[model samples]
Target: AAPGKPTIAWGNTKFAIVEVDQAATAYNNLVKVKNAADVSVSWNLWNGDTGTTAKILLNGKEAWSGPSTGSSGTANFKVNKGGRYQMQVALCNADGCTASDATEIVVADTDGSHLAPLKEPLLEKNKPYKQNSGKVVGSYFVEWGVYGRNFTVDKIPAQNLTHLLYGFIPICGGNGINDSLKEIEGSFQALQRSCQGREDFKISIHDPFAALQKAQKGVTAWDDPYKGNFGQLMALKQAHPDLKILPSIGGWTLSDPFFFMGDKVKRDRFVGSVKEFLQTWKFFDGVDIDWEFPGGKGANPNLGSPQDGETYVLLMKELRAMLDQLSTETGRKYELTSAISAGKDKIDKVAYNVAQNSMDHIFLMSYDFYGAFDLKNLGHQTALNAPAWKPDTAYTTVNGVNALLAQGVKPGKIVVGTAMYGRGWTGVNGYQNNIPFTGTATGPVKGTWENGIVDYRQIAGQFMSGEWQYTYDATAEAPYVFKPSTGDLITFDDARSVQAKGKYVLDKQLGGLFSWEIDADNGDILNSMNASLGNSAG
Candidate 1:
């Protein structure tokens, strides 16, 4: 009963022992130093029994171990970063108290693999990657709850995660006027959840343009975009190892300025701003341009012309050059990617070529092909195209991929979109033998967000307790139904079609799959999609 601390393994290295947790699971060893004065203490670590030093590795590789001789025991070891680790420690006492018990600790301080996102709005989302022995690396949706983070760091599955698209609605002039950075603090902690031990997951930011614009009102000093400050982004990255932080430009709301900024002067200015932002941050992996569409008005402003499309490419090329130079000088690779609209029309018209030839990978917004608006229009829950249309296999989900691939876009550079919610239609007047039928001639049933808008979370309750029975559409490869009794209409993708889309992505050999918002789907759907992708399931 001496007051001496145990010598437990701190990342396979013997170190000053700390407290233990009987019910807690550990990823790596944890140790407390009574004094930082002798912080140069060196210690030895092993597989405890010394029988299997080769297999029980640290940070997925072999670790260094040796004896220590010192009075001030400030033990430390450079590890490979993030992982579930067991550490063996030793105290530097000459009395021969050489060994102590091993400790389990998660070295959540690195990034790896490809942590991709999936839109929870689509019921069948996150399935393709799961079925292909791939797991969704992470989600883009990080909301801050009252008690703690929206989702705990434990929810991020740090072992195989490559990157996490961390979002924060900063008080920028770009997002909603009401959105504030103060409110995002909750989400910020949620981001900390990914790096359970430290900061394992990378951060990809999507700043709110409206909020940024609001903040920038009457302030003409800096014309920089409304994302967070370079300092914020850089700090997040510096806090972690190889965390790829990038700002996703031009979401639905940010589209206007993006399209208009495509002008040579404006584009050049934008490019300069971005380059400055990157240089300033130093933590970002690269950039993800999400123009919704580069040449549309309703979506973006004056974003027209085949030439405008070329401008977009040129802008990217210039941006890439700048990023590449910075990377070469700094010994890091700055990534460059794009988010394309799911609309075949807009994507094919403006982004198709650029996606095929300009950037690294294309994040396809694949959901919303149909909705409650199309309740009358039959189709697969998820496919190249709806079955209710005249075409059978002619225009389905597979067709979309084929279309892109045919345009010379490499399969390895594509990532499909999956949704987490359901679509519904109301005011439907009938059904054939209870085989749900839509009133195509009569038009969409009715309701707000009625034309095929609305997510599953908002409408699932309506379906389960007799509000509207969810029906499947085998022909379209989706699900939909029209009630002759009450005229309620509903349509949406489920785990089945999610599996189909996952199979399609694998069969086509695309880069991977992603979701719009992971929170839209119910827990079961999320689990199903994860299972489908075979993500870390072994």
Candidate 2:
């Protein structure tokens, strides 16, 4: 060791500091210490050293000493006090043992007074935080239902609904707010025309809600609550202050715009526009991001990206921050929620930490497991559990809910979704209910508006008329029906199945249960749900 010269190598393969660059380690050598702080310390090995045998010292005390085989060895530790924390690694080889120079990590003092109070409290796992009133029963109100379905907000059973979501309000063509006002008014008028003679249309579908706009008769965008759908929703909210109305953005069709969310600029633009939109409407209590999916080939594959998983987490985190800021301005806690796919492939892509923390609640779309695609082999559309005959483990409510729980999401924050309609395939063999791999079907059974899908109201009539035989699958804990002559198979959530789902939510301590659209059911399904959940509303 000379004053200015490098040392020359020495004896037969002795343990030495061949690589002592602490700066090259994975984690930064100097890390800021906070409460629950953790860091990994790593060091390179030498002289045929496999790093199998190593000793880690913290302030001259042996913090970790073990045998691990690799080119490098790492030891993790957590610190609380403010001090000069030194970490040293002693490694062995075939020759001898050598200790590297100590790396220092300064643990700074955490001022409790400076730290802000936790905005979001950590949830207790496995504990059901039941409301004193009752379990949450939420339903969606599709915008289009006012026309073809002749279903209106008045049709919604106010007493039964805890939360009512406006099915979808688009992101406005990947630009900004959807300024289409007249469209909403015209649709409501059409609904009025369709419902004039029907006794079920108890209320006159009039406005305030159907008031004409000042911007244009059929073509302008007026940023006001009295112009369009916003006015209608405001009317609904004013009447039923107890119900929570969240405006959902992006459904099956308009989800492609979510791809723009991956970019920070585009995401910020969307979030900013949304805040203004909600402010303009002044009726929305929260916003729901129904992107359909982030990483999957949802409605449009062009929207899919490999980085969507991480990008989605970033978008949510930013959105949560914005929503909280808006909440402060409005003097109300505006919620940030998302509806995620129940499929394992899509579920696996989500960043659970961000997904759980950023969202006030997560809605699990647990239905549509089987449909026309699998017509040849019949399956329950909304089974509580996978039947013994069904080998696929992921296609059940039990597994879907459990999957989210396993991903570290709190059980009480998850809302399990069940379909309000039935899915049927026509021209199937008469192999009746509970049987899998039956003969093929020609097409979908007749639905009110859409093929392959029928409202529960329609199915209820068929069930009551004795035209279809309703059978229960004990293994699936769901219900299905079979047509003897027509060879039609329909899988739906009847009173028995809905009741079972309600019980499942209660037993699992889940957030609650939600249906796809409110218009599909004529009170039977919801009544069964409330009865099963023990309607204890205060």
Candidate 3:
């Protein structure tokens, strides 16, 4: 390249270099030479008259300097023979030596790469697919209890994720606590109040767990203790008229009875109640059964007995009939989904059965797989919302996708779950070098949530204010950070990681991403999700 002016360029980047007068080599430190060779000697220089304003120097103090700003340059030095040579590095600014340090560089024959350097890396595939090259995409969250923290949607960055899981109808137990009903209303209101105006983001609701609970009305603990009333369902319709409701039934708490609904009569009664609940809701756009698991047979059994691997699939078939009937009657597209387990074992055992064309998609509860739910342990480094598998441990989204596919689930219909908050660990080193191998510890963090987890509404402020630290893991190609000294381990998503996951979704050509809840991360995480998904809502 021709010189633009009197600028010095060196090495590979060809950056222009400048010289400063105070630059000189300090000889206080000794350099041990192994053989006779040509090397450049450098040090920080200073003028005795001036205080401490020093500049870098080279050679016998000819002031051979590069740009006053930090830039690299070379100066020549020839060792007579193999012997110990001493050189010191003193720091000064126009003034004298304010600081000093010594370093030993091996005097050896040159290997060629340095003379001609290699190019810096440019990210070739932002989203590296587990094994294949396909695009993945989806909503970013599903709700367990995303209420009052409603404006939390404002926290979701635009298009950072493909889909939005407007979570929780909150009908947890039988009709005991109407609190979630209020929560659902609040969340719905918040979503409309804060995010109703955006196009880049789309909204979907994790339907009420109350179908059985509310319908049975306190008959069994297996039902939604606090069943939502027509009033609550009406409010949901009013708030998100366009919203799709995927009624996620049968969680770890309520799933057992459905695993064996008693008999054919029981199954019909349960399925009938489900259908009536849909009609009552009026706004229910879809159905997402959260039967935590099925008894061996994949079928939707009302009685407790061993069935083939196809029982769960059979249930989906029943659900399909119900949803199809509602759609036909209402002339609307009623979405159908299921809340699946995160681990391969649960997914294979229960979810594979449902994958048989009975459902529209499988919301892989990805984040909760390896969390320290039992003993204040560190959560999975990849944030529960992360892609399946560990980079270091050889995990991939394909594990879930493959299992479903083997049982006949379509890639385009798989919605992966990502977590907004992180799980954690304790007892980390506080020093820089002594930090966790990944630097920061994931939560069960202090104050945030020790044995529990807190969403962004509860934790985003800390991060925005610099209360948290972040780091990356090369092995997983994922980012993680842990706080030393304090035992707070938070492993939530950031825009960068969100972007990477988005890239993965895009590459795999999967359905999209989902979140356990939208309220845990800062708005930027959501923004990154929207941006990554390139949502059409502008």
Candidate 4:
């Protein structure tokens, strides 16, 4: 595919945050592009801001231009004259290029504004988000992993964990549980009515063949009352009695139904369904709300609203109330939890503190800050700290829990997360001049199960087979494996970084640690975490 238009954002420039200069040497704005060999930054003075003195002096001149810089380079002016100007960034290849929309910037008086290093804050040694902690060592188990991934419930490291989160169970509308199952069995196709409204919301079993119908050992298919993963889960529970198995509702796609919480009538029915879901799936210890985000950003703007932040907490409260009420009758103290976001904008969007009251633990999704969504530019998705050497996103793991705590959500309620997989990019260049997150790349590499993703197990195999080289970033407390031949790089968590995150959980006195999914592990990531957390799974 041809490279997409560049997305430009004026960076917190080192030389000048609000102004630029002819002599300054700072990366002024971040330029995001993919599948293109080069980037260009060119500008002309803004018409309204141009004066006769500035215009006459600079007319017919190359005000500023960067043909291209190696690969995925940032955009900034090599200014000739000073004034307000608009820049158009573009990415180019044999197919030519496409320029981004012009962005305005001001140039200082060219009189020697030198470069100052961009300083991103690192995690302080002893600053915990809160004083207390919880023993919540967890990992997600996606039911469909039994399909293409061939990862079954038995693959879970139950002996090393206290929490096992099952993802996911979508909400259905009216009494259409049968219809919902058919829709879900159609590769998570939405129920339209339920996934899209009203007070008839009900919980659905995503895949009956994988979740119930398929026979496990000693169970007959199409005849057994309990089979498939649910049967395997029952047996797994028998071995580890104390493990808290929760069915997470509303993952990245299923989160559409969460929009159903817009009304109190809908919320009440939704909570009722949640109560019934747990009572029916008695082995499940609780429910986990994985509403990717409270604001409409997850599904789309029209499917969500600014008012979602309020309804989000209200929905949680309703669930919390029902869980507590059910505990009285069932005598099982069901837990209420959620997989919360790491983005600063997401945290600020919700009345988080109020939701914390209803939640047992906020499993902070501290990974995926960067991925193929970032196109060709590489970034450490699960870094503990924002890489100080580059202009990286502030959505690091430490930044997440800190932001959560800063918003008055207690550390005891915060559970930091790690990825059991890596984000991959291909056609990357300049390893000889490599620093951090700098590269020339065509696009995402092919993955084990999907493009731009590789399971930790597969990455470990590549390293063992001598096809990949591993390196550790102590500053970011992460590790990456690179293949110089293919010009591909995958930033992932290895034993070393997983241990460091384990230490971070202990030092910060945060609630605990949770891995994205257990199915991706090659053993090292989990063993390292269990050892570092000093957890023997009591």
lDDT of 3 by residue, 227-269 (tens): 2222233233333344344545544433444544434554665
Runs in model 3 with CA error above 4 Å? 1-242, 295-309, 351-354, 374-398, 406-408, 428-443, 447-450, 457-459, 463-468
| TM-score per candidate | 0.57, 0.66, 0.54, 0.70
Which 10 successive residues of model 1 have the least lDDT summed? 112-121
Residues 1-538 of candidate 1 have per-residue lDDT tens digits of 1113334424322111122122222212121212111112223343232211112224333354443433223344444333345554443233333334455543321131111121122222222222335433333544221113233222333222344454332111222221222243543333223223521111223322221222221212232221223322322343345444555755554344444444576566666656655543334577777665666644423345666577677777887887778788878887787777655556566556554555766777676565543445643334545555356443356666666776777887777766655554555554444444434424553432335544555555455565455655555566554455666555556676666666666676776666655445554445544555556442
Candidate 2 Cα lDDT to native: 0.62
Model 2 steric clash total? 1
Worst 10 residues of 4 by lDDT: 48-57
Q: If ranked by lDDT, best first, what sequence of candidates would result?
A: 4, 2, 1, 3
Ranking by TM-score: 4, 2, 1, 3
Assess each prediction's global lDDT (C-alpha) against the native: 0.46, 0.62, 0.43, 0.66
Q: Model 1 TM-score?
A: 0.57
Say which prediction, candidate 1 or candidate 2, comes out ahead on TM-score. Answer: 2
